[PDB]
Structure formats: structure tokens, C-alpha cells
């Protein structure tokens, strides 16, 4: 007598790394980096009209 | 009498009396955004690393503070509404039971006061299963299965028999008067002047002073059931679509500049909740960004409705060929944003 | 307790061959089945006037 | 490294021949079209499923 | 509590049918009654066979007294050789958190204390069997603490009917209709429950209570005026129909009434016996719920973070 | 240990980080693109409450007791006409095109100009972005509109700020080609993507 | 064979340097300090590792007995007893010092010799009373014993119970001495064995208890086997117009705090019956045969019995129409006078088999039967009356 | 490190007088919905406890503090309020300073429970919310002081104001709105006790009717005993029936409801180290929880 | 359960009182258990119902 | 299918009301699009979606 | 099978009153003094049948 | 279902269809298999007739 079980293949996903600038919704904002935001207390921007 | 009117509504007899019906519906709709180039400035921070030892494990919680600057002077972005997916609320029939309410004092004789409470709750859908706890919120029994959606809560308001139905064929208030704060001018008492001053007529109806004498006046029967201060509900978790209208303290604290009041109904906190089985008051931590045309204008929209089922069938031909009146019966064709839709 | 169109179902007195004394004692009782005879013995909610 | 070379892409491309069949463009992708009356189920007893 | 905590080890016998091994791995979070706080025990000590009394199989109402004589513990991780659990009366972990899987029909909310009930309800009666070791495992149902005080009150009041030659089965919570499975109750443990009642019933009656009984005509007059007082009587209390017939009045004058406060002494004796009695019948609510990523509802069939309750 | 079994177990252990690391460190760039829609929805008013308001403010304020209240009729009437549009009056190429122009003309050109303007292949820079659901985009391309150059130029560098209490941005152009969609509406090229397959695919998150 | 030597060498060198926080908080531990008169505590005599019990700053006492006593008993019996005790100190009898020098603590060995006449092993108990009289730093120490035991007799009779006044304070680790006052260092929460002594010649100490009060319910219940044990503090009360009783016990048992009550009933149930029968003098009965039964079951059947509506009641037009019921309760022995032994959560032993010894030490030159415990971890708790 | 710290963010728009009161409130007890790292201040305020419509009374504040989670504020940054929760964050650190709002002094080794401000206030103008801080008074007084205020309310339908702890006077009367704020607790006392003292009096139809001081003890002792004779010493065995057995269950739940309310468990014990034993009003006290 | 309403008709409790209740005339004709048919080889289309 | 793919993205946890919407959105989608070509053919723009 | 529902046909109780339906639905009367008509709701509605 | 059975000849020699597990043997429950070699006491070799 000869018997055996088997494994056939092993399949995975690939998580798509998505840079935000790959989108063109980033036209709608000017996205600039603070290295520090949590220590700031005053968040006012001057507008000249 | 509250005992006596039980008898005449079971045997089909019409007492000298009238009603309005108020209920709230929720639609899930698709939208379209648009925004010109630099509509907003965006600042993102530098992320932190954190550690938290629990339950045979170590949590790393990565957090990062990020900020927002609306660079535009004026309106830079538009929500465009589009086709409707689902009437999530079923357009059904529910009588609201004030036996969940617990606020109002009962009548004296416990032979009679219990005789109503057995004969109203049993076997009503919305009636309490176990009688109401001393402090807490009472519960509505679990329905074994759901058909279309959550069943909206109809409400009933005492109105005269002899209003013109033409007041209802176009959009209006369940209240007999209009409300603020859009209609008000610039004076300290203007919000309450629109509410309860009856030497002056209504804004939206300059033909007369009111539409409902039993509402829209101080200590009216329409108000003292449904005023937010007076607390005849609150033990009831079931919603009340009248609460958005008859609470005078809510309108009096409203912002009044139409530069800003448009945006607030672009995203407003609903009073309703989706995953709730029937309509229920919102839990304190969940807030859904919901567009509310009923929020600003203080109006509600009439549906296609009639009293003959025969004369109702003239409406499905179209708008024009529906007859409106026949000797006592009547039709109300809808005035709604959903007018020409398939729903 | 409304189950068959030719029969009335109702609560009756337990353990009684009838007739039958003057006042039957209040027992727990069970559902006794009797034969509806005529069309008029149907309840008028289901055969209107 | 994530993600490395899959086992399945290590093979060489097999030798191919030319087959006459109908190819239909729908949307973005080419959809292969067949009807099976002549090739299969012609003059048999098996009903066309 | 130690600096590392204290973790008992329940060893598994070597004779294992492989389907019973996978049955133990589904017991990831359950509640286990230990008789001692010995460090090493066996599965025969945990299981229902040693959990019986001498010659007599205990019923559902008699199983509550068997719980409070023992030590509730929670399985942390199932190993191939043994089962590691942490006791609850002992300080539970190094970190202060345990996962508990709900074998319960009812969802959980934050902050609510958990007491635990035998398998009582219909339909969901689920007992894991280890048929290679011929063992049976009856695991308790974690429930919120006002619910457990209802179920004990429904069972104990059922046994008092059996001493008197309708109805009391149906409960309600979150609008759910649910009844409970019970056939008989042994006359032994009911007397142990009932004697635990009436001694604590009597010890609330002090001299100030008769002064409080004079306010029975005041409440039945006050329930006319406010609906909040109508939320008391509920038409099923004795005191609504008791006020309709009896008009009591105060005794006068009390002995040494100058030096003492009779209304104050009646309340403190009431708070230590009758208000205590929710602890005396069932076991204590040792555990409440504190979700960290804030989930207001812990759904039926899921784990939950767990922190002790004083 | 020195065993091959123990040394193999780190390959299961270290890569258990690198799957979780590259998910969470990819979960923040999508964390922008979540809130990017959420802030705009909190700011953007609907159409039927804008089309009279642009025609009101072009007269000026003229803040009276009267001429202010002419908006309210012209809000209500313009609400119940054009709250919903596409289910109300579809199947008509004429009326939809003006409605699409009503999206483009209801907003003012806003301060300020960027240094790194999102340019096209041989084209003028992009002046606006539409955001629609998935099934509406299929209708808006098979009908009523045409697709244009799928490749455009996008700045890759994030903007950098360094504290010196007054500090100015430094930006550098590094353009790359990006597969996208360009639609010509009226007088300006308009961007159009759907955000179902790129972001929110197989999560527990509702589409806002 | 080299890799097995390397794996052993690597694990030990990694095992020392990778130790988190440099082994500072590897035992969890807490400490207390308090500056108290040496009146009822002699830390010079009672060495490191004995129980301490705090008071309620006795100015509260003499009118709480005026407020909480059962009727008929004396009120000023407590205040006259306490004033004689402060006389027997002969150091702080003037009351002029306020805010400081409370003499708040009571050492455990002093409290044993106060209630010593109520124990069983009198030969063991008198040996405890010997070095209380001998080894303490003071004159006429037995006068303080006679007052303070009479005070505890006056606690129970004037019904302000000592377990409402006494409370657990941590065990002794070190003391700094001066005349009439000692800086007392103790350990409120955590293990006793982790507490640094201060003497480098003698490291970590243990719990020292006299063998008169130490009771093991592993013997009289016959329950063997290993397991963890819960230490307890149990008093005894005997209420009578007679001079009253007191005891203190430290009970080692595997039973929970939720289940101790039938066990203390099995020991002290003989004392439980007495305070139900007696302890009600002088509490006058009502007039005999006055009380009626309840017609509530009876009147509810007949509909012809007159009722009242919510508009009727509080009017005398219907107060005479209803049934009149006047209860009396002045002869009731109720549970606050049925009080006896009371307990509290004290601490637990996480050993598999709990370690107990029975040695005799000096206390020069009094040899005292002493039970020595090992590895006690402290968790204080509320008090609980078994009434 | 590994110490847990909740971070409460203040919304901007604080006026210079408003931040000074928040600068002063350093060691106080503050409740919160769920243990979490970052959290708004809107869930902290007294407005977050409402059910309507209705500002919650003394009964609801006792019910809320079981479901709410106690936390003590640490140092107060102008950016954020850093507070640590008591039940999870303190088990690693061990020592937290705590300032009394109570006028009652604290001795060493005392257990301290939390009481809502019924014994007898901070409101912010610019942020439009109120703050109510509970009172950290000792737990043996806590069962007393609550029960004294209940005893006053029964008199509304000798002096109750005398409370002398560790050599100090207390005046409970000090008035108007304190009585009506406490009215809901009074009614649930009398309804619980009178329903208790009818059902026991119906199951035992002759408790009061039994003879005084000697037969009652003989009735007590056999009921007090452990022996198997239990049920025949108790029970007394158309027309309407008294629903007694249903009235058992509704009373036991209402009694079981009030057990969680009026326990007032010892959350906090104070161990004074390197200092005076007596901790007075307005003084930071060190806190050690159960290990 | 006729204390509860129906899902599909939340207006009332039934549409036929002689169906949709235990031991109805609609029940005993066409239940799978109670078995007035089956020996008829002819179908019963509401056997699925 | 076409209602299910409009469902399974948002709200994987089947909230009980939104589950009940899927029943009615099968039916209305079924009675239109069960059969297609015999219902409304000869319309090029209608079929190509 | 899934829905546990069923579909009505075009039916009426007069043969002459049925003849308003072959025109189309929108002009067919449903009711007349005691008689009635039930227009169908079916997936086969807009077919050749 | 389709059944392949052996009407005559040896039970062994029929091919199973699984070359992994070839030729089969007779399986009978022990409640029915009753010898008469015991209840007649007759041992010895030989062939036997199943009944």
C-alpha cells in the first residue's frame, strides 16, 4: 500500500505601496512637511486682501 | 378623555379633531466633488513612537499630528449631489408611545390608569416589553426579522379640521408658524418674535397669523408635548422628528450669517443613527456628516398622498392628470427634490 | 386560537363530561374544539356585513 | 526582501501556435468569445448545459 | 499580586484524540474554576466530574454555591502539553489585562462589571466534551452584573413556588426576549439560598424603619403629581396595594431619642444587609471591561480587554 | 539556538514585522487621502445653495431687510429643482453640459499660486479636480465627455519647512509621469478619478 | 561541543546586561513613615516584622458613644475609661500638644496582652504579658494594660466598635529612637521580604507573631493539601452588662473573603448565640400583646374593604376609614446588637505550601511562643461585620 | 518608562483668565469615557454627563462614575492636559500626588473613595463648558456623610449636622438647591425599604405580631442556625392574587442596583512618606493603589 | 410569533389567519411532517413554502 | 450580484438594517434585470452598460 | 427559493374587464362594483409574453 | 450512486480503482460471524463453506 497527501502552491497578495502624490487629488492641496507641529500653539496665517 | 378617545378610535368614529403626520427619512446618495487648484494648505508633522504592554503583547501606537489651512477667500469647493441609491428608512407606519416617556403625571385611579397601559402597549409594536425602569432608558423589543429598512417613527399633532389643504400642497412647517433664524432681522428679540408674537403675521404666510392654533403659541398643546426643555421624553430612546422643530432654545442659539449657514448643512450632525434597529436617539460618540435641507429652512416636504385609494391611482399616470378633490376626499401631490425620481 | 375555517377554538373547563353541574370549578382548562356548523358561524371580521 | 521572485514566473514562456477564434473589445479589456454547438455537443445525447 | 503575577498550570493527560486537541484550542478565553491556588493541577480536577458533589449531581441553582467555594480563573494560552491560566482573586497579570471571549448571547458595554452564571439559557447550552479522556466541561457564561442579579432573582423566586402546593421565565435586556432552561431544583440548596435571604431580610428592620413606614401614604400621594414617582411602583409592587388599605402611623416617643438618630441607624443597617445581598447570593463582580481602542460594544463571540473591579 | 530550526524561525519572525511595518507606514499616506476628502466635505456647500449665492454676491452685499430675503425663495426654488440632477433629468446631452459648467463656475480662483504647478504633457496646468464615485465615472466617460492625455507631470518632493519664528518653504521640482485622467470642461482642464481601487479597496472604512 | 559552551556563555552574559531598568524595580515595593509617641508601641521591644494598628485620634470617641449607643446603656463610660488611660501614660496627660504626638499606633504584642485573659493557652498568654510588663521602656506598664483593656471593654459596651477605630498599618522594618517618640518606618503594600532593613550585617526579615493568636483552619477543618492562604484579622465581641470580652486572631486559611462567614460561624457561633440573647439590657419592651398581625393578605381578597385613591390619602376624612396599624419595635435585639467577630482582608501567601514555624525567642529574658511566617505580601482591605 | 498617560487636547481660543484656573487645578480627580491615548476635553466636562435635556443629579453622578473611569491630572501643559488613569496607569508607577478639595483632613493609611460634589465649581467662559470635580474624602466617612444627607431628606416629608472626624468640626448645613439636587436618592431609599418591609412581612405574616424579646430570639436563633430545619420555619403554607414572587424580583434588582452605587469602594489609599501624617486641605497627598 | 409583527407586512400580524399559525388548515394539508400528500406522485407547489 | 458589489465594500460588519436593505435591493434589481434582451432590446446605449 | 415570495399574473374576475390590460397597464382599470383585477408583477413582464 | 460488485470468483482479485490502495478483503461485523467449528468442537485443517 502507498498513500500520500500533498500541498499544491502557496499564493499571496501584494500590498500596493501608495505614495500620496501618485494621486492627482494632491493638486487640491499644497502638502508641506513640519518636522514639528505638536509643540506649536499658535496656528494663525495672515491673509492680505 | 384619554380613556374615552380609546373607544372611538377603535370603532372607526371620527371625533371632532385633526392631525398632521411628521416623520423623518434618510437617503444614501452618491456625490461629486470639485475644487480649484490651491483650495487648502496642508501641514503634516513628524510621527511619534509609543509602547504599551498588555495581555501578553506589546502595542506600538504610531501617531502623527496634522493640520489644515483653508487658503481660499470665498467658496473653493462644491459638493454636487447625484443619483439616489437607497431609501434606508422604510416609509411605514409607527405610532409613538408616550408610555415610554415617563415624564407626565398619570391619572389618579390605578384601576383606570393601568387599563389604558395594558390596552395601548399590548400588542403594539413600539410598546415596552418589561415596564419602564425607574431611572434608565426603556427598551423596544427586538423584531425577529427586518423587511426593507429601519421603520421611521410617525408622529401625530392636534390640528383643526378646517385648515386649507392648500397650505399642505406646497412645502411648509408642521408648526402653524415659521421659525428662525434665517427669517429674522437684526434685533435682540427677533428669533422669539418669529416664534410667539401674534400681533404680527408670519413671514412665510403673510395671509394670516398662524396655521395651527394648537401649535406655535406659548404653552400650546403642540408645544408642551414636544418642547425640549419640558422633558416628556428622554426616557424613550425612540427618536422624535418633531424635536428639531419645537425646541425654541435650539433656534435661539443659532448662527445667523448666511455666509456660514450654507456650509453647516453641507455637513451637519444628524439626529438619527443607521445601525439602530428602529429610529433611536444618537449615542454620544457617533456623529454622521449629513446634509440637512430641513435644518436651515424650517420646512418639510409633502408626499404623494390621497385619501381614496382610487383617486390615488390617478397620480401614477403623472402630475397633471391627477384629480385633487372629490366631494370629501382629497389628494396632495408631492413637492419634493425627489419629485421626478423613480422612488 | 383561530386555526380552522370549519371549527371554533376556545378555552374550556378541564376534566368535565358535559352536562354538567351548575357552577363548574375554576380549573386550569384546555382548548376544546367544536364544529362550526353554518356560514354565519364564521366571525364577522372575516365575513363582513 | 518583500516581495521576491515568485516560483511561477521563473519558467520560460511555452511555445505557442495560431488559433482562429473571435475576440471582442469591451470596456478596457479584450474579452474572448465562443459559442459551443459545432465543436462540442454536436450529434451526441448530452443536453447543452 | 506579584511582580510577575501568578500563573497556574493545568497539565493535560497524554492520551488525546486529535479532534479533542483542536477542541481545547477553541477554549482560548474561557473561565475555569480552580479549587485551590496550587501551581500544578490536572484536567480531571478542572472538569465537571470532580466538580460534582459527593454522590449527587448539582442542579443549576445549587451550582452557584459551588462557584463561590472555588476560584475563578481565565485560560490565557493553550499549549500542546498543558493549559496556562491566571486566577482572578489573585492579582491577575504582570500587565493588568486579560482577553475574555464571550460565550454569551448578550453584547457588552464599557465599564460594566462582569459576574458569571452557569449554562442556563435554552438553545445555547454548549459543553465541550473530551471523549478520549471521557471528560465533560461546563463553562460559565460571563454576563453584565445587573443581568446576573436578575437571573439569580429569577431562579431563587422559582424555587419558592415549589414549597407551595404564573409565570416567571421571561427576561428582557436591550429589547431581547430570552427565557431560560430549568426543570427541577434540589430542596437542599434552595434552603441554603433562602436562609441566606431571610437572615439578611430581618437584619434591615431597625427602629427607624417604622418611621419610614409612615411615609407610605406620602409616596402614593406623590405618585399622583410626578411621573418619576410613578416609575417606582410599577403596579406589581406590594406598596401600591399596601398603601391603598393600611394607613400606618408613628410610634411615640422613642427611648433615649435625645441622644440618638433612629432614621440614621436604620439606613446604615439596611446598607450592610439588604443592599449587600446582591453579593451574597451569586459571586462578586470581580471584573469590568475597559476597551483601549475604544469599542463601545463588545460583540457576542469576540474577545475583550479585562481589568479588575475593586 | 545553533539549530537550523531556530535560525529559520527568525525568518518567520522578522518578516512578521516587515509585513506589518510596510502596511502601517503605507497606512499614513492613505491617511492623508482619507482626511483630504473629509476636510473638503466639511467645507464644500451643495450646488443648489450656491447658484443663487454667486448671483447674489455679484450685486454686492446690499444688506437690507428685503433683498437679503429674496435668496430664501431662490434657495428653496433652486433646491427642489436641482438638488438631484442625474436621476431627475438624465438622457439629455444638452442639460447635463451646462450643469457640469455650473461646477466649474461656482468657485473663485483662489490664492495662492504654487511653484510646482501640475502640468500636462504638452498642455496647460490642471485647474481643478473632480472626485466622483465609481459608477458615475463610467457614465461620464461613455457619454457627455472625452478622455484626454493619461500622462501628466506631478511634483514628487514634499515641501520642507525648517524653523529658524518666521520661516519660509523650500520646494524643488522633480517631475514624474503618472497615469491619470484629463477631462476638458469649458475653458480649463479638469482632473477626474474615482478612488475605489486605489484607496479603500478591501477595508472596513466607508467611502465618505 | 563548542557551540554548547558558547550558547551557555552567551545566555549568561546577555542575561545580565539586557536586564531592564538595571534591576531597580524588579520587586514592586512601597514604604511609609510616621512619627508617633512610644506610648502603646515599643519598637525597641517589638522587633522588626510585627503588626501595627492605627487609631482614630481619640477626640472623636467620647461623643460617638453618645450618638451610636443602643438605648439604656451608658454614654460617658467610654470617656471616663479613656481619660484614665491618658493618666496612665504620665507623659502626655496634659492635652496641650495639638496636631502632633498622636500616639496613633498600637503594637500587636501590646494588644494581645490587653485581651490576654480571654484566650485558651493561658501559660502562653501570660508569657506574652510578661515581657509586655518587663521589656517595655516605661514604668507601671501593667497599669496601662488594666486601663486599655478596660477601654476595650468600654469600646464594646459603649458600642463604638474597635474595628471601626482600629485599622491596619504596615509591618515594622526599622525605627529611629529618641525619648518618648520614635520615627517609625513600615511597609503598607507589597511583599514583606523586599523591604531593605538598613543593617548590612543582617539582611531581610520576616513576620513575627505570638503563638497565642495564630490560628490555622487547616487543622480543625481537616483540609490538607497545598495551596495559597489568606491571612485575616479577626476580633471577638461578647456584649453583656457584665465586663465584656475581646480577642484578636490572625487566621491562615485557603477560604476567600467571600466565604469566610460559615467558617467563623463554626468557631465562634457559641459566642454568636449569647449576644443575640443578651446585650439588650436595658432596652424596655412594649406593652404585652399589643401588636396585631398583617391583614394585607386578608384585606386584599375582599373587594368590600375600603380603599384609598391618590387624591384621598393624607386627608383625615379617609385616614379613619382605612385600616390603622401601629407597629412597635422597642424590644428587638437587632443585628447591630447581635454583633460578634469581624474580619478584614490582610494579606496572602503565594507559596504552594505555606510555611509556618513554631519557635521561642527572647525578648531577654522572657521566652515567648512565637509563630514565624515567611513571604507575606500585603493587601489591606475593608472591615466586615459577621452579624 | 512604560508609564501610561492620557493626553487631553484643549481647543484653542483660551483667554488669559481661563488658562489661569486650569493652571491651578493640578491635582484633581477627572473622569473619562474610555482609556485612550488622545482625547478631547468635551468628554471631560460636566455637559458630557447629560441624558437630555436634563443636567444629571446626584443619583446619576453616582451611576456615571462606575461607567466613567477615574483619572488624576498630572502636570498641565499649555498645549495638552496630561492625566494618568488610576486603574491601569498607576500599577507600574506607584506614586501620584493628589490635592484635596475636601475640608476633612487625611490621616496616614486611610482608604479614600470619591464622592460627587454634593457636600459643597469651575466654568470656562471662552470654551463654553463647565467642570465639576468630585470630592476625595475617606471611605468610612463616605458611608456616613451620604447617609446623613439621606436622613435629612426623610425629615423633609436632634442635629444631623454633627460630624467630628480626627478632632475637627463639620457643618453639613453651612442649603437651598442642595436639598432638591438630592431628592431622587431619597425616593429610591424609601421605595426600596418599604417594599423590603412588606414582602418579608408578607412571607412571615407575624414578625411584628410575635412576642417581644424572648420568643423573637427563639424565632431568630432557629432561623440563625445552620441545621437542615429551614423551610418549615418560614413559609405560611375568582379572588385576585398578590403578585409577591414577581415583586421579589423587581425589589431584588432595585436593591441590587443600589449595591453598586453606595458601596463607594476604596479606589485610593494614601501612604505618607517623608512628611507629616496629617494631610490637610489644599495639600498634595501621595497615592498608592493596591498591588 | 404573533405578538410580533411580520417582516414583509409590518402593518399587521398575518394575511391569512388560516395559514401561518401552528396547526392551521394551511399547515396540516401541506406540511412536510403532517403528510397528507407524498403518496400522490403529483406535485404540490407550496411544499417549498 | 450588482447590489452585492455595491454592498461588500462599505460596512463588512452586517449592521442589521443595512442587511435588510439588501433583500429589497435584490428584488427590485431582480424584477428589472432578470432577463434583459427580451425585455428591452434594440437600444444600443442601453445594452452597452 | 431565496425570497419565499411568489409573483401574481394578469388576472381579473370579468373577461371583459380583462380586456383593458391588452392595451397596456396605464389605462387598465382595476376595480368595478364587486369585481377586481390584479395586474402582474413578474420578471417576464416586458417580454413577448 | 454507481456500485461495482463481484458476483463470482475471488473477492481479492478485482481491481479497486485506487492503485494507491489495491485489492480488498471481506469486512463483517462480529455480531453475525458464528463458527460451527467451536460449537461442534471439530478442529483440524480444511476448507469451509460460508452460509
Automatic annotation (TrEMBL), chain C:
Protein name in UniProt: Major capsid protein
Species this protein is from: Human herpesvirus 1
Full-protein interval shown: 541 to 589 of 1374
From TrEMBL, chain H:
UniProt keyword annotations, A-Z: Capsid protein, Host nucleus, Virion
GO cellular component, as recorded: viral capsid
A single GO molecular function term of this UniProt record: structural molecule activity
Pfam families named in the record: Herpes_V23
InterPro entries: Herpes_capsid_2
Domain of life the protein comes from: Viruses
Protein name (Swiss-Prot/TrEMBL): Capsid triplex subunit 2
Biological classification of the source: Viruses, Duplodnaviria, Heunggongvirae, Peploviricota, Herviviricetes
Gene name linked to the record: UL18
UniProtKB/TrEMBL annotation, chain K:
Domain of life, per lineage: Viruses
Protein name: Major capsid protein
Organism of provenance: Human herpesvirus 1
Residue window of the full protein shown: 1326 to 1374 of 1374
From TrEMBL, chain L:
Name of the molecule in the record: Capsid protein
